[PDB]
Ligand binder design. Structure first.
Ligand SMILES: [Cl-]
Ligand SMILES: [Zn+2]
Ligand SMILES: [Zn+2]
Length: 235
């Protein structure tokens, strides 16, 4: 957890202590999460070094970094890293999953694609609420689940992906069931209104009235709770 960002063969070394300092002003960063004891990480290491050197030499350069997930537990938690090597591209501070091959040609091409100023992530099914539209959305929905989250909160990240997955399955229903989220650190006035004092905080709204959500936080369970609570008890 040293403050210094060292470079090892062209590749920056990031850890729980220096990660935010380093990435906060970078539009695009390539990340590798590895474990010291992983043979496949060791085999990939020279290829990742070649990638770092290719991306350093384009105009403008794109930083390439590695993280030891076994000692950077906070980061591995934030990025929901379970297996190695895991590659991610950080674009304006948000993680994009890389599921392709561990080759220079594919990784460099994808990095260059996401680095483009007009590149956008796939749109998400989950509704974004702010003080401007919160009431209009919530009051018109027969039932709606709302997650109040803080971007700074590490323990939350493990199941943030499950929430989007649940939202996608629930939107394909007749009638569709909406899931929404509220960034409580940005939306301080909504957070106070609903007495948000900790995270995650999930609330079900039924005809505009809030109820604490005490269901499960895994995809299948969120989907089932919501289906059953909407009036399909046998489903
Ligand atoms: Cl209606
Ligand atoms: Zn209506
Ligand atoms: Zn059920």
């Amino acid at each position: 957890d040293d403050l210094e960002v060292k470079e090892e063969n062209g590749v920056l070394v990031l850890n729980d202590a220096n990660f935010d300092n380093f990435v906060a002003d970078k539009d695009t960063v390539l990340l590798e999460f590895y474990a010291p004891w992983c043979g496949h990480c060791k085999q990939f290491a020279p290829e990742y070094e070649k990638i770092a050197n290719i991306l350093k030499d384009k105009d403008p350069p794109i930083p390439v970094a590695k993280i030891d997930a076994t000692s950077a537990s906070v980061l591995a938690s934030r990025f929901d890293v379970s297996g190695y090597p895991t590659i991610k591209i950080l674009k304006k501070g948000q993680a994009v999953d890389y599921e392709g091959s561990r080759t220079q040609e594919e990784i460099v091409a994808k990095v260059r694609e996401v680095s483009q100023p007009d590149w956008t992530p796939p749109p998400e099914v989950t509704l974004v609420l702010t003080k401007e539209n919160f009431d209009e959305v919530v009051n018109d929905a027969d039932i709606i689940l709302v997650e109040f989250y803080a971007p700074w909160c590490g323990h939350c990240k493990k199941l943030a992906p499950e929430y989007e997955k649940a939202a996608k399955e629930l939107s394909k229903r007749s009638p569709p069931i909406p899931l929404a989220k509220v960034d409580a650190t940005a939306e301080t006035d909504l957070a106070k209104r609903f007495d948000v004092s900790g995270y995650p905080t999930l609330k079900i709204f039924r005809k505009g009235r809030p109820y604490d959500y005490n269901g499960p936080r895994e995809k299948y369970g969120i989907v089932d709770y919501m289906i059953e609570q909407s009036g399909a008890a046998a489903s």
